[PDB]
Symmetry: C5
Amino acid sequence: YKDDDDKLDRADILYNIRQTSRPDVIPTQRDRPVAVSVSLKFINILEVNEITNEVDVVFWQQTTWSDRTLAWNSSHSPDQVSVPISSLWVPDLAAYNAISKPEVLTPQLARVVSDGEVLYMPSIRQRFSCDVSGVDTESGATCRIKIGSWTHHSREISVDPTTENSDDSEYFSQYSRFEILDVTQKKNSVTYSCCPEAYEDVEVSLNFRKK
Amino acid sequence: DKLDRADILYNIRQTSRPDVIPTQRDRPVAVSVSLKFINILEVNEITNEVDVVFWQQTTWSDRTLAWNSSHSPDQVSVPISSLWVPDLAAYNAISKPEVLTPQLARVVSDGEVLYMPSIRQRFSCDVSGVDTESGATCRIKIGSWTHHSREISVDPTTDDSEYFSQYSRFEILDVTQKKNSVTYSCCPEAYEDVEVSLNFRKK
Amino acid sequence: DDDKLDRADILYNIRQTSRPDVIPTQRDRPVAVSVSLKFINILEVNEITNEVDVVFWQQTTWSDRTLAWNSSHSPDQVSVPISSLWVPDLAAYNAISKPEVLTPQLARVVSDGEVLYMPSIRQRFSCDVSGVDTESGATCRIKIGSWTHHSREISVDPTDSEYFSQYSRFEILDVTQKKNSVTYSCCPEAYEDVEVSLNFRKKG
Amino acid sequence: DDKLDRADILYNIRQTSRPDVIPTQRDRPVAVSVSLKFINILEVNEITNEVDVVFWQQTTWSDRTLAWNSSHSPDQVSVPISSLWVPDLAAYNAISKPEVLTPQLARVVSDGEVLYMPSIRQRFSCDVSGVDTESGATCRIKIGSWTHHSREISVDPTTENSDDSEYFSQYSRFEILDVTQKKNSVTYSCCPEAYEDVEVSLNFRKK
Amino acid sequence: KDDDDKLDRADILYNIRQTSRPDVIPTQRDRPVAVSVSLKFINILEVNEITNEVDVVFWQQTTWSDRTLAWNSSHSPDQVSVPISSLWVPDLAAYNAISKPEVLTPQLARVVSDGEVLYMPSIRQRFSCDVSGVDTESGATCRIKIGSWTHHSREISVDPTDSEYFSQYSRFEILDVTQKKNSVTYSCCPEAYEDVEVSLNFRKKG
Ligand SMILES: COc1ccccc1-c1cc(N(Cc2ccccn2)Cc2ccccn2)nc(N)n1
Ligand SMILES: COc1ccccc1-c1cc(N(Cc2ccccn2)Cc2ccccn2)nc(N)n1
Ligand SMILES: COc1ccccc1-c1cc(N(Cc2ccccn2)Cc2ccccn2)nc(N)n1
Ligand SMILES: COc1ccccc1-c1cc(N(Cc2ccccn2)Cc2ccccn2)nc(N)n1
Ligand SMILES: COc1ccccc1-c1cc(N(Cc2ccccn2)Cc2ccccn2)nc(N)n1
Ligand SMILES: *[C@@H]1O[C@H](CO)[C@@H](O)[C@H](O)[C@H]1NC(C)=O
Ligand SMILES: *[C@@H]1O[C@H](CO)[C@@H](O)[C@H](O)[C@H]1NC(C)=O
Ligand SMILES: *[C@@H]1O[C@H](CO)[C@@H](O)[C@H](O)[C@H]1NC(C)=O
Ligand SMILES: *[C@@H]1O[C@H](CO)[C@@H](O)[C@H](O)[C@H]1NC(C)=O
Ligand SMILES: *[C@@H]1O[C@H](CO)[C@@H](O)[C@H](O)[C@H]1NC(C)=O
């Protein structure tokens, strides 16, 4: 703050974050799962198949977590900096019903806050297999997207689904063939017969309609 | 906590040889492959081609990666570039395997390594009778590309209802796997591969 | 100017001072980043889906005057791979494809410390196409800003078809680039963005 | 087998192996053998004269500086091809990048032979006329080095096809009739020297 | 006949990487670097009559010299293959390309012992150009601008030069190909940038 556009300060913070960050290791502070907070803000619904139950969409994946080893006294340093994600540890998030690669359309940077929180918001385009039934009714279709960690169980990573549907058309495209009805993010946990340990995910329920 | 996990990752990088196969004694390295399908995206009966998504459940061990986890974590997530991985290939594939998931493996304390990419990939196989109640049966041949049977053995394993999409255009009747071997006129040595047979039909 | 030795040394100097991940802010002032798009063709237009497939030259310029040298007996500009430089993390907010880059990824660094960067980009967008079969034409807006830097770190300044292709199915009516400000009911600080207005139509 | 034997052989290869320099022993060209074994014909366009196919590029050449005594050690190993010199093979009538569908590894034999066989999907312009008849279409593919003279790289075409059935998809909408490979040396106004290739001729038709 | 001393080739390659400067224009004598560019078309695949776009495959014959790479070819090879990773290469771009160039060949060059570098990627790119009368006897006449992307004329000068490499199975034939020197000057920047106009005149067959 104040002296925020201090280039030397910024260089040093980044040097520090690199001396300290370990990108392949989960920043479990203590014992608790890393609380990974995830929220999708959709931008567009591009392609929709009534027949094959497949949607093409574009969403901003608002993602956050803390690694307080990264932290620093921002008394006379800047409050945040931007850091290429290849430098930081990043939750290994994935969509379990994804049917195409997550396509990132944005620079792969993240903000680190002086308190050790990281804000990561990539713009993603991706296809899913989900219920497209009734997309032309006016109760609308409801497409459910499941996202959590691919390899870290619940005692290692937990998903917080805190989200608001009020600001939703601050994000969505005025020019879509579709319109958003509601977005519902519910936290739940999934186990698997083969395997111990429950994996936290957020279930993002996308309610939408052809205009 | 994470200084343990950090140090376990250091040990893995010390010992691991991502390019050399971890042969115990003079035994083959035993690889378990088990496909659990999630989607069947496209199917052509005129060309005999299929576009599927599946979780490739894979396990083997390297005991040199093992550690005493009395008072340290039991497993850790590790980037597969740091480990040896079986060089597996679907012999009858017709697209590159597109991996949909972070390329991370789980390394267990005993030296077991758990790796399971979600894969999207296209195959040429028998689609005759997809529109029929008895369904088409498509076999996918997965084995090692460079290691013959004395270096790598591929052992199948395993139920399917817990993975496959309800919203699919198709349903799964049955998925069965069997160990198979591959030889060639030109080439001495046999190659193990698992034959996954996907029996399926339109809803 | 072309004395090769001067050039290898200027590039060595730049790689010593260049901090490719750190913003070149000076005097606790933002980095000023002029952006201007020069459209080069409009390849595919879809009026049912409101998507446009365009190819454009993105004139980008800003300065880091630590990179400066005394060119009194030295070349005034050099070409420098952008791997070696900080670059504004520009993104198009209503893009729907990743920016496919058709050109060598070099920049020109000028002895005064100004950096001239201009990639040819083909990218699909979600914009307004209604009226493209009308003489007043479609108007399609593209919003470009920094992805992670708010206004106090990065500013984006605003500024015919000397560039546009004469073999496109479409003709350009006008282009206007106004500097608008973005905030969200979410995050405190404003983001500086240049809204580019492309008014164009089909020929007939 | 024996892991540290295998590790050590890898170390040895990475000491001696020069991935960017041709392995010319006793000053004559590197012989490269090339055998294509088609796995499927996925798409043919009869009017645009283009075929899309899948094949196994059986490639072998020798690099004797790579050799070791295999009395009490493995006979071959697997090696990532980026640790090795590979021939710079190209298909002159290819109209798409080669899409390698398999692990990019090779087998180094203890006599210094390299064994490399990528599975490849590529599109070619060739003759697809008569694909619906039964003398068939014959699609000629031309492969050779992109930058090396016959004096630097030589191309062995030796090739059987009695075993075509072992490779080709039974479920293809086409059937192979024959595949013959002929060496062929080409000169260029550009350059003094001639560059060898191999014509592969894919005589095929629908079923 | 000493083209094959493998150790000799190792050392030349060693010498090249020591002297080479992959990100520095190799300007001799305060000359601009002279780059010859020459296209030998191979195919024309997807001509679209309405969008006015064509899809071509062509071998970009490209050459220039860097005398600092030169060695005595007296008792050593005349040329060597070298990865372009290790050499400077002109930042050439097709100004009216609407797709990225897709290089279909190993990205190597030949360095001759005089410092001449021969570089020829086979390329497959999509262009926005005049495709009027493709199925007439006059043909379509599609022109392609290829120049340095960041170097002006005092830095790089681009110089020009049948149908001997064009595919007979193409649905098109080549009438003529002409290549002209050219400049350019934008109401934006002072200097002029040299380019090459390549004029491909062609038509459907029959
Ligand atoms: C509360 O919502 C969030 C939760 C977690 C992480 C990020 C956000 C977030 C950040 C955010 N910006 C900062 C930011 C941080 C980091 C990366 C990119 N951006 C602002 C902004 C402005 C213009 C383009 C893009 N992003 N904007 C929105 N809508 N949400
Ligand atoms: C027999 O089962 C296996 C055999 C070998 C390897 C993996 C498995 C396995 C692991 C597994 N998970 C852990 C894991 C290990 C490693 C990588 C990713 N995941 C659970 C889980 C849950 C939610 C998303 C993802 N993975 N889940 C399933 N179904 N199978
Ligand atoms: C206002 O003009 C600009 C502002 C900022 C950055 C670049 C430009 C600019 C540069 C420019 N050239 C130099 C250049 C600099 C750097 C990179 C590429 N090119 C000339 C030229 C000519 C033929 C192809 C390409 N570029 N041309 C145009 N029209 N604009
Ligand atoms: C005459 O045979 C060849 C000549 C030259 C190069 C390779 C071969 C070759 C090798 C070969 N295998 C070894 C190998 C070496 C290297 C890479 C992959 N494989 C076995 C095998 C069998 C099933 C799938 C994969 N590979 N199989 C066949 N059919 N041909
Ligand atoms: C006037 O001719 C040229 C001018 C400038 C640059 C290249 C050439 C050139 C070189 C050339 N060959 C050498 C070479 C050098 C380097 C890379 C690839 N090849 C021969 C050859 C052989 C087989 C495939 C391809 N090219 N062939 C043709 N047609 N043109
Ligand atoms: C941060 O630094 C300031 C220096 O003025 C100091 O007063 C303050 O106590 C420090 N805070 C912490 C938590 O160390
Ligand atoms: C592992 O280490 C613990 C102490 O850390 C020791 O008591 C034990 O004997 C060791 N071995 C096994 C198999 O637990
Ligand atoms: C640059 O150098 C020249 C001579 O080397 C000198 O005359 C001049 O004062 C220096 N500084 C500037 C800003 O030109
Ligand atoms: C191989 O090794 C053995 C023992 O090291 C040695 O006696 C022999 O001469 C070597 N060469 C051959 C061809 O056996
Ligand atoms: C090397 O070059 C020099 C001068 O360019 C010449 O005198 C000599 O004949 C050449 N060959 C050898 C072997 O020195």
